[PDB]
RNA sequence: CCCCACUAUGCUUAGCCCUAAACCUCAACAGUUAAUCAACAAAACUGCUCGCCAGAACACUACGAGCCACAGCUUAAAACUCAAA
RNA sequence: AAGUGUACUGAGUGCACUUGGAC
């Protein structure tokens with residue numbers, strides 16, 4: 128009929144979802160070097176999702192991994208282990 | 224052989240431009256208030272930029288300027304609002320004077 | 323199914339540790355487990371002091387006995403590890419590789435909070 | 445080298461020293477700051493009691509104990525005792541939230557002991573004893 | 582009234598403890614506010630917290646503004662702590678009684 | 691059963707014990723330990739805790755929305771560009 | 776009412792009692808957004824089924840009955856009174 | 861602060877629950 132009729136199609140300009148830094152990467156309860164990144168250096172308190180910038184699934188996975196490591200003796204409970212202080216800062220925190 | 228409205232929309236430069244995020248356009252100053260420059264850029268709304276600290280005097284009515292558009296219309300939904308509130312002005316970054 | 327036994331052993335000499343690991347694998351086989359593989363994460367200072375068998379230790383050797391066993395064998399394995407003295411601490415978990423890595427497209431968009439306030443004409 | 449606020453790693457070759465003594469070796473000045481008392485104990489790295497002080501010891505009685513001046517006097521007395529014992533530097537570790545929490549350190553410094561590290565050890569129970577119900581006036 | 586006096590004492594202690602930390606706000610904590618006293622209205626309609634003023638006028642104004650902005654949050658923190666089951670609105674009042682003594686001693690010197 | 695002095699320890703810089711203590715207290719407040727201590731001085735019944743948490747979440751979201759709205763509409767405060775009309 | 780100490784009790788086991796503002800005070804299922812509607816509350820409705828109510832108080836009461844194993848719960852009235860509730 | 865259930869005591873208290881309250 129008329130070739131200029133707008134067509135029914137999905138958005139091509141839509142951008143892919145912002146994958147969380149851990150999305151598609153398997154969290155493990157033995158990767159203390161990783162879990163340390165998501166706990167408070169001075170107290171060992173687990174950072175909330177509003178600080179870790181992680182989706183619900185991976186936030187829960189990190190929480191469970193941290194608890195499992197702590198109870199099984201892989202991770203200190205009351206502090207980020209000093210060996211991992213130089214690791215990249217992946218939590219939006221402004222102590223200083 | 225008169226182009227239809229659909230054809231005009233299809234071939235409109237504004238349609239040609241995709242999403243208006245970070246796009247570069249050549250806007251035009253059309254109203255200046257002290258340090259506020261009201262720049263129209265062919266869109267529905269205008270952007271209210273501020274006079275850059277460098278070459279401020281060069282910014283005068285009718286001056287063609289470069290803009291990085293962030294949003295054609297500044298709108299948002301507030302708590303419990305039944306419709307989006309719009310501030311009736313685009314959001315763009317003044318990159319300087321086009322020559 | 324496929325289990326992983328994380329084992330923290332009292333830090334001590336090579337012949338001693340080999341004997342303890344052999345005894346543990348013997349216990350697993352008696353309990354019917356098909357020991358898959360043995361891994362060693364080395365010795366290191368325990369994150370916090372752990373007491374066991376009228377004693378406390380600060381350094382331990384970490385190992386991961388991956389195996390398969392009938393479900394019933396797990397309780398017996400737990401009891402055996404608890405009774406053993408050379409084991410600072412033994413835990414048994416469902417082997418992580420068993421769980422499938424369900425793929426997430428990414429972070430889904432966050433709309434306005436779900437009906438946290440009324441919609442009446444107010 | 446740029447300064448750092450984390451404590452030195454025990455069992456690590458840290459060039460930091462104080463009169464040649466290593467951080468772990470420095471005596472420890474426990475400070476318990478309860479609601480109605482403040483107690484200080486400077487103890488050797490082997491936790492040998494080197495000096496002890498409190499508001500009760502300094503004579504402040506009942507309410508007067510919960511005062512910054514009382515805490516300062518306790519700190520000064522403990523500092524004098526520790527100095528007589530031969531102490532110079534001290535690692536301050538504090539628990540509780542008594543009013544003299546800072547005045548105790550103030551008095552200790554005024555008495556002349558160099559605080560090299562301020563540490564907290566507040567007994568925060570993850571979940572244990574159920575606390576008593578709330579007062580009402 | 583003895584009950585009112587006890588309430589004033591408890592509220593003074595609680596407010597001092599609150600201000601000891603950034604709990605209310607880092608901005609408030611940095612100001613290092615010192616409370617002169619606490620007085621409860623006879624009907625329990627308000628709680629006036631008399632805070633000592635400093636010499637700097639701009640500092641006094643800024644401290645007053647921050648205290649007024651944080652009074653409601655402090656009230657909520659108290660009622661949450663259960664230091665008092667019900668706390669009336671908190672009003673921060675400047676205290677300047679010590680100025681007379683200070684300037685006396687200055688002149689007398 | 692942990693190592694001592696590694697948790698909640700701040701090294702004083704050049705002896706400004708006041709500054710170091712302020713930093714430590716800031717750390718405690720940021721991690722919420724002070725909240726926990728002062729709330730655990732007494733026992734909040736589960737019903738009260740639930741009500742308080744719901745109220746806190748509602749107030750947090752309301753404040754966030756109000757601040758966002760204020761920031762969004764602040765731009766219009768610019769001097770009137772059509773004065774005299 | 777505040778402070779101190781302490782008991783039932785909160786806990787484990789094995790049995791009982793069956794009541795809560797047991798509440799999202801909004802029954803299950805299916806469906807709709809077409810024309811809004813006492814008021815407030817959680818926008819308004821349609822179909823379909825079960826349960827429940829027929830002014831207030833007497834009355835979470837009495838009698839009987841069931842569970843009890845005797846001090847209690849469930850079921851649950853009547854008379855008299857009023858033009859209110 | 862109010863109230864529901866429950867138990868002791870002689871209106872309060874104890875435990876849990878609801879906002880049919882305030883922040």
Ligand code: FES
Nearest residue numbers: 147150426428429
């Ligand atoms: S965003 Fe995909 S797993 Fe976290």
Ligand SMILES: [Mg+2]
Nearest residue numbers: 782783784785
């Ligand atoms: Mg008992």
